[PDB]
């Protein structure tokens, strides 16, 4: 009473996961390999709702306004032009 | 006494600055909590609470703080 779905991890390995036929199959499955993988059948519905992580640039922007950054880069280049 | 003997070694406590000194002295015991028979029954340990006089001194301000301290049973 089971249906078998196959997933493919980003590195190319493929894995067989037996499921119950009555149950709804997922589009991604944590795999014995340790990586996420994608079902080779139709869907494959969803992005999973990725929000980008916080970056150093983000933390600098919230204090220095872009103008202050520009004048600073001005100070720095005008110093490089003088050799 | 052995207790005072190890307390002499501690007194005083002084950082590299010598600006503050924490001094110990005068150990004291109260009467035993419970009797031997009572402890063997109630699964406790036969013990007297110990008390100490702790003197903290600030060399900059020259202030003294004397406090009685409970070491334990």
């Amino acid at each position: 009473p089971r249906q078998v779905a196959r997933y493919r991890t980003d590195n190319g390995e493929e894995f067989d996961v037996p499921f119950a036929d009555d149950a709804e199959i997922p589009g991604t499955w944590l795999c014995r390999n340790g990586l996420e993988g994608t079902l080779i059948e139709g869907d494959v519905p969803e992005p999973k709702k990725v929000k980008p992580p916080r970056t150093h640039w983000d933390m600098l922007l919230e204090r220095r306004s872009v103008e202050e950054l520009e004048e600073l880069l001005k100070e720095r280049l005008d110093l490089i032009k003088a050799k | 006494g052995g207790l005072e003997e190890v307390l002499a070694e501690l007194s005083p406590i002084e950082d590299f600055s010598g600006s503050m000194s924490l001094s110990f002295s005068d150990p004291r015991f109260d009467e035993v909590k419970a009797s031997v028979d009572e402890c063997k029954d109630k699964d406790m340990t036969y013990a007297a609470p110990l008390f100490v006089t702790a003197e903290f001194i600030n060399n900059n301000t020259g202030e003294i703080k004397s406090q009685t301290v409970f070491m334990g049973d």
Partner: protein, 73 residues
Amino acid sequence: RRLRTVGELIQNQIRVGLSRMERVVRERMTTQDVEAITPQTLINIRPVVAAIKEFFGTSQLSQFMDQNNPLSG
């Protein structure tokens, strides 16, 4: 050849407990707001009693009294 008796075996375990506390007393002074420090705020007695409790239990010189007869004890 000695022969450290019970009083001394306790003294040594107390000495250890105090030295472990002196460490917290010394460092405590530094990060504590000065003039807000008291003999108590610098003193944390956890390591002193632990030495005693951890000596009577788990130590090979502290044994369950052997009593099947007065002579054994």
